[PDB]
Ligand binder design. Sequence first.
Ligand code: COA
Ligand code: ZN
Length: 197
Amino acid sequence: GTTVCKSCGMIYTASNPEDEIQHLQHHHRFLEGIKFVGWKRERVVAEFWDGKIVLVLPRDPSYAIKKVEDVQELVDLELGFQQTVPVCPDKTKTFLFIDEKRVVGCLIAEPIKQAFRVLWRCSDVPEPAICGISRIWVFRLKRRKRIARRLVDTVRNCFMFGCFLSTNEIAFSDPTPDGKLFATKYCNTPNFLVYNF
Ligand SMILES: CC(C)(COP(=O)(O)OP(=O)(O)OC[C@H]1O[C@@H](n2cnc3c(N)ncnc32)[C@H](O)[C@@H]1OP(=O)(O)O)[C@@H](O)C(=O)NCCC(=O)NCCS
Ligand SMILES: [Zn+2]
């Protein structure tokens, strides 16, 4: 693909009439999915020079829940498979990284009671853990800009508000190769915690 759309990330050949119409339609579906405009209430939990993180809590309004689900449909398409869903959808906390009225990062966190050290295989010895990182995604063109690091930072101070969770209290659900490279660095160990492995 000779052309990269800076706004939806699609890679395609602008010279091709098939491609330009298909990009037009992909571009529309994508920007609708990540657009972040007109929430009556935003629970802003962290502010940065290049964006902010908004927290969506259980029993928040329909429009917030729907926005999370729209983003998750795009992540499902990008991954190409159904990642293990949260056990109880009404206990999850969702963190959205917003930049220029767009969702460019999403972290879904769920309560867990145990996790397992990874060696890929993992140990059969359960370790007590508090917070399961059930989903983590950053828009492709915004990667390697610390968005995922800041989302996990924010989970560590918001998931159990009033305490700062250690990297021994968070675990990563069923990590992808990208997730494994991220978690190894974030946790400063190749033997971080996982669940749904
Ligand atoms: C995994 C993911 C969320 C990381 O998001 P990100 O915002 O780019 O990550 P960060 O910028 O916070 O990365 C922090 C460190 O993690 C490491 N890291 C992150 N992503 C990496 C990658 N694709 N390859 C190697 N190292 C990587 C780097 O050490 C990075 O530090 P550096 O940029 O200073 O070198 C992102 O790659 C993604 O969304 N991938 C597609 C969806 C996916 O697979 N999610 C994981 C499911 S477990
Ligand atoms: Zn586009």
